[PDB]
Amino acid sequence: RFLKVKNWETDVVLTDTLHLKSTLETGCTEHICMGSIMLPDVRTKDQLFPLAKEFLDQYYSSIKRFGSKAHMDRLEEVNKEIESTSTYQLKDTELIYGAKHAWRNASRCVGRIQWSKLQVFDARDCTTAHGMFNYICNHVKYATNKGNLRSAITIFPQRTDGKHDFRVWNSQLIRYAGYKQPDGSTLGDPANVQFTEICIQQGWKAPRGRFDVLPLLLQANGNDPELFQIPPELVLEVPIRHPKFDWFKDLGLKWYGLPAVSNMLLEIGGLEFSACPFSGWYMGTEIGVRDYCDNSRYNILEEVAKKMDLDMRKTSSLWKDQALVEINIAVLYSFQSDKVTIVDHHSATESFIKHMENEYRCRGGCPADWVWIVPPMSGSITPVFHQEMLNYRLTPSFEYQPDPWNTHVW
Amino acid sequence: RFLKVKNWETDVVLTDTLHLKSTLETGCTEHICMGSIMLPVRTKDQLFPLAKEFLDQYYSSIKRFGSKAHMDRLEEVNKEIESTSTYQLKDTELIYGAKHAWRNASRCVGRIQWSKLQVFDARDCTTAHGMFNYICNHVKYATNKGNLRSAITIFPQRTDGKHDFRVWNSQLIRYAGYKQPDGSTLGDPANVQFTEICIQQGWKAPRGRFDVLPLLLQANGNDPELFQIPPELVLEVPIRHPKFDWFKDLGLKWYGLPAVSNMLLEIGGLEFSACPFSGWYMGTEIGVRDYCDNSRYNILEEVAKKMDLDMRKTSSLWKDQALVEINIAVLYSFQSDKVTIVDHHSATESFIKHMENEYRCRGGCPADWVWIVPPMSGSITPVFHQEMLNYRLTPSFEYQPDPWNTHVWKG
Ligand code: HEM
Ligand code: HEM
Ligand SMILES: Cc1cc(N)nc(CCc2cc(CCCN(C)C)cc(C(F)(F)F)c2)c1
Ligand SMILES: Cc1cc(N)nc(CCc2cc(CCCN(C)C)cc(C(F)(F)F)c2)c1
Ligand SMILES: C[C@H](O)[C@H](O)[C@H]1CNc2nc(N)[nH]c(=O)c2N1
Ligand SMILES: C[C@H](O)[C@H](O)[C@H]1CNc2nc(N)[nH]c(=O)c2N1
Numbered sequence: 042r043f044l045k046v047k048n049w050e051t052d053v054v055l056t057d058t059l060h061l062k063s064t065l066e067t068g069c070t071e072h073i074c075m076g077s078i079m080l081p082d083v084r085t086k087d088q089l090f091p092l093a094k095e096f097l098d099q100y101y102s103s104i105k106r107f108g109s110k111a112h113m114d115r116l117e118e119v120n121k122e123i124e125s126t127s128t129y130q131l132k133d134t135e136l137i138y139g140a141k142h143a144w145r146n147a148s149r150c151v152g153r154i155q156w157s158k159l160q161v162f163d164a165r166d167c168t169t170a171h172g173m174f175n176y177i178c179n180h181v182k183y184a185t186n187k188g189n190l191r192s193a194i195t196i197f198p199q200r201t202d203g204k205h206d207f208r209v210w211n212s213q214l215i216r217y218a219g220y221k222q223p224d225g226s227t228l229g230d231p232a233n234v235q236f237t238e239i240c241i242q243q244g245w246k247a248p249r250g251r252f253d254v255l256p257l258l259l260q261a262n263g264n265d266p267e268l269f270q271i272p273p274e275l276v277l278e279v280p281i282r283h284p285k286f287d288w289f290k291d292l293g294l295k296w297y298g299l300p301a302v303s304n305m306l307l308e309i310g311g312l313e314f315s316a317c318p319f320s321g322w323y324m325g326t327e328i329g330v331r332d333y334c335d336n337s338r339y340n341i342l343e344e345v346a347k348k349m350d351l352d353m354r355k356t357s358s359l360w361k362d363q364a365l366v367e368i369n370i371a372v373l374y375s376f377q378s379d380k381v382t383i384v385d386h387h388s389a390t391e392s393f394i395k396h397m398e399n400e401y402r403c404r405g406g407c408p409a410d411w412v413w414i415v416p417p418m419s420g421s422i423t424p425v426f427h428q429e430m431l432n433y434r435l436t437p438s439f440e441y442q443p444d445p446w447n448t449h450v451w
Numbered sequence: 452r453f454l455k456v457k458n459w460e461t462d463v464v465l466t467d468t469l470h471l472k473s474t475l476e477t478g479c480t481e482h483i484c485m486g487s488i489m490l491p492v493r494t495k496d497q498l499f500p501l502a503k504e505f506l507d508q509y510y511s512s513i514k515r516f517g518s519k520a521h522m523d524r525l526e527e528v529n530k531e532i533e534s535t536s537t538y539q540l541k542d543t544e545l546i547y548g549a550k551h552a553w554r555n556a557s558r559c560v561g562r563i564q565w566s567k568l569q570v571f572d573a574r575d576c577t578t579a580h581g582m583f584n585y586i587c588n589h590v591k592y593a594t595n596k597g598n599l600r601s602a603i604t605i606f607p608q609r610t611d612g613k614h615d616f617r618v619w620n621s622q623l624i625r626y627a628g629y630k631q632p633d634g635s636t637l638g639d640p641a642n643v644q645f646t647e648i649c650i651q652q653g654w655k656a657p658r659g660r661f662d663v664l665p666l667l668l669q670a671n672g673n674d675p676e677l678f679q680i681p682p683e684l685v686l687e688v689p690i691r692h693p694k695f696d697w698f699k700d701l702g703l704k705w706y707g708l709p710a711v712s713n714m715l716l717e718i719g720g721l722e723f724s725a726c727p728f729s730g731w732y733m734g735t736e737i738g739v740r741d742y743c744d745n746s747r748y749n750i751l752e753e754v755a756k757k758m759d760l761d762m763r764k765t766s767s768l769w770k771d772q773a774l775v776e777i778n779i780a781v782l783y784s785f786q787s788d789k790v791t792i793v794d795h796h797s798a799t800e801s802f803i804k805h806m807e808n809e810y811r812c813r814g815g816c817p818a819d820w821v822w823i824v825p826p827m828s829g830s831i832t833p834v835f836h837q838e839m840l841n842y843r844l845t846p847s848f849e850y851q852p853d854p855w856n857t858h859v860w861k862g
């Protein structure tokens with residue numbers, strides 16, 4: 042009940058007490074661990090006040106005014122507001138606290154040493170998709186900051202009775218289109234083929250190129266979603282070159298500088314914010330390992346290997362591994378050269394271990410999903426590989442939610 | 452209760468029912484996942500259900516469930532238990548048991564091979580010298596002049612827990628580690644404690660970087676005894692790189708036979724505390740962990756230096772670059788010396804096929820993602836994208852404490 046975690050490379054042991062405050066489920070039982078499973082109607086008013094209370098309690102605890110009249114007054118105020126309006130509204134201060142802590146609690150995020158330095162954009166006054174478009178252009182411009190990226194989140198109005206949901210239909214604010222071929226092949230990004238179909242079917246006219254920035258598909262107040270094009274001058278992109286291989290440029294690869302997740306749900310004190318796009322800056326391997334070399338993605342390993350003239354007849358030459366490294370060198374090299382913020386997996390995991398130790402000391406723990414935290418290459422030469430982690434769900438949180446097109450009453 | 456797993460690279464979905472036969476605990480609860488935690492005597496009461504379950508499984512597999520042979524065997528074991536408080540496995544049951552412990556080993560990626568296990572029955576062994584003889588024969592057989600063969604040797608089961616057979620080595624073949632007065636380590640840092648014990652027990656240490664450790668063997672709960680594996684039985688491979696001629700001058704070698712000897716084999720409630728088993732290496736075990744862990748030989752920087760990599764910034768990925776070259780050399784060296792080895796691409800691919808087959812014929816395949824995914828190049832192997840369910844089936848291999856922590860010394 043007072044759990045120990047050990048680092049097997051440093052012999053450092055941390056004691057976790059924070060997990061006792063966990064409230065959501067893991068998917069695991071005493072008989073079966075689901076640690077590697079990717080994905081293991083509004084609330085009633087009686088469901089809502091304990092959630093509100095738990096949140097307000099930790100909020101007022103965090104500002105050293107637990108059990109203060111100010112604390113009790115707020116509980117009173119929210120209590121009556123729920124009883125009366127069947128929901129409640131967060132103070133700006135609570136909204137910001139809740140958002141920062143939802144990031145703080147994201148057990149799958151390696152970048153959380155930055156959690157307290159999050160720019161929060163309150164878009165709760167937004168009423169239309171054009172409004173959403175404006176807020177999102179501003180977010181993108183702020184976060185991008187000419188390459189010196191800054192973490193941000195924009196929060197649109199909370200769910201009411203699920204008839205009026207605000208949703209950003211795209212999974213990231215910035216992503217490349219994916220197209221069909223008669224070839225049976227896939228031009229561009231295969232991950233986005235379905236969303237690209239909906240765009241076109243909703244009226245998008247695609248350039249059908251390999252790296253076309255998708256349009257935003259925005260849903261306000263439960264209305265039908267609308268298409269908008271992000272001003273191209275707001276989308277910072279990086280051409281990919283290698284510091285030693287001249288021919289790398291000829292592959293014609295590029296990627297965008299701003300990782301901005303837009304399909305998740307932010308839960309704070311029982312309230313649900315279904316449209317809450319957030320962004321930070323890339324770890325190199327996200328692009329170079331996953332985006333470029335996953336077989337279900339741009340899958341560029343074989344082509345890079347050929348140009349390196351590696352031995353591709355047997356797998357034991359480790360040509361895949363060799364090309365993998367060179368591709369990831371090029372990504373880091375490119376971003377760095379264009380002064381666009383990026384972190385390599387060694388630095389990021391090093392930072393996360395420092396963050397863990399900080400969290401264990403000042404908070405009593407740090408929920409962490411080893412399967413997601415360990416980088417997709419060179420795993421055991423990063424310190425996180427040898428770090429035992431405990432995974433559990435704290436609120437406020439970011440949650441997954443159904444893709445809008447499967448849900449939307451058209 | 453059915454359970455689905457999905458492969459996110461291929462969209463293949465499999466359904467698990469085997470998890471219903473799960474006995475032991477995971478360490479997890481609905482409130483906390485302990486999937487990345489490395490480590491999370493029996494009375495007559497608990498033993499016959501465990502025996503009956505095993506025997507039911509055994510007789511099902513040979514298609515004799517409910518037969519007179521089945522019923523007689525249960526009666527026979529029941530009597531033997533009530534009479535003697537334990538029982539003895541038939542040869543066929545021991546073999547079945549040991550193969551299925553491997554088959555159930557959720558942290559093992561090499562399980563496609565589980566049905567081809569040579570089982571050596573050493574349950575008639577009584578002394579340390581006897582143990583040494585059995586283990587020499589295991590080593591010779593498994594090694595097979597480089598054409599490695601999977602094998603396990605099974606020593607007598609626990610009785611009252613005061614007469615345990617134990618191999619004190621964590622692996623049958625492993626290199627010594629010596630902590631120097633200046634804090635540096637000569638040889639393998641992972642074996643410094645066991646090396647010190649061996650030295651205390653009278654081993655004359657050569658004190659070099661690759662000294663094969665002596666066997667430290669405990670029979671029948673007596674104090675352990677030192678034996679030197681005959682050098683001619685210990686197959687080793689000089690590590691060379693196919694393009695880098697300076698690599699041989701690093702002076703690296705490794706042994707060919709991976710043989711785990713510190714685990715406990717459980718079969719039908721019986722505990723076999725000495726049960727060394729061996730297969731062949733996946734390259735990354737040596738090339739990534741053994742050579743490149745910071746807490747092991749830790750050669751990344753010297754390799755990287757000799758490669759003249761840009762080492763002033765980690766974002767040059769000089770560490771990753773050198774890691775690949777080292778693992779190429781390990782594979783190159785074993786293959787050119789005709790010593791069985793498998794690369795992590797081949798092995799993980801075979802595991803996926805095995806796992807799928809296991810779902811179809813067995814209703815599942817318990818698997819620990821954290822351990823199954825290789826320590827380098829994770830997502831370019833197919834196991835990275837495979838959802839896995841982890842649960843515990845018996846027969847099984849279990850962890851047990853290091854014997855020097857529990858042993859009552861006779862003198
Ligand atoms: C600032 C630098 C950041 C870095 C380096 C970073 C890094 C990462 C990485 C590598 C992943 C794994 C995703 C994958 O492989 O699919 C991830 C996931 C995640 N991150 Fe962070 N992140 C950063 C900022 C943020 C911010 C600002 C937030 C929220 C405000 C956030 C919340 C999350 C969440 C909820 C996940 C899980 C996503 C999912 O399950 O699909 N991160 N992050
Ligand atoms: C024949 C080729 C084999 C290969 C390529 C192979 C591969 C591996 C690898 C790479 C690991 C991970 C160990 C680590 O990184 O710490 C492992 C673990 C394991 N293997 Fe296999 N193995 C093989 C044979 C066997 C055999 C013959 C047995 C038993 C009869 C076995 C049972 C196990 C067990 C119980 C573990 C987990 C051990 C622990 O947690 O310390 N394996 N195997
Ligand atoms: C805010 C932020 C910063 C940062 N560096 N990375 C992220 C995660 C972005 C990301 C998303 C996704 C899609 C997630 C879909 N889930 C619902 C399964 C994939 C990847 C990648 F590339 F695979 F690593 C990266 C988010
Ligand atoms: C039989 C067998 C074959 C094979 N190829 N590999 C193995 C595992 C050998 C191995 C052991 C161990 C000791 C693990 C400690 N546990 C008690 C937690 C480590 C490693 C390595 F190198 F880290 F991968 C490899 C066993
Ligand atoms: C803490 C973590 O579980 C530990 O470092 C594990 C991670 N995965 C592993 N995977 C393998 N194959 N071998 C290991 O020793 C480990 N160590
Ligand atoms: C099936 C398995 O859970 C899946 O491949 C996970 C593994 N770890 C991951 N880790 C990160 N960072 N991102 C991912 O998408 C995944 N995918």
Ligand SMILES: OC[C@@H](O)[C@@H](O)[C@H](O)[C@H](O)CO
Nearest residue numbers: 621641642643644645646713
């Ligand atoms: O030096 C002693 C170690 O080899 C030993 O404690 C092992 O780590 C242990 O047997 C676990 O494998």
Ligand SMILES: [Cl-]
Nearest residue numbers: 300327328332
């Ligand atoms: Cl991405």
Ligand SMILES: [Cl-]
Nearest residue numbers: 709736737741
């Ligand atoms: Cl090893």
Ligand SMILES: [Zn+2]
Nearest residue numbers: 069074479484
């Ligand atoms: Zn679990």
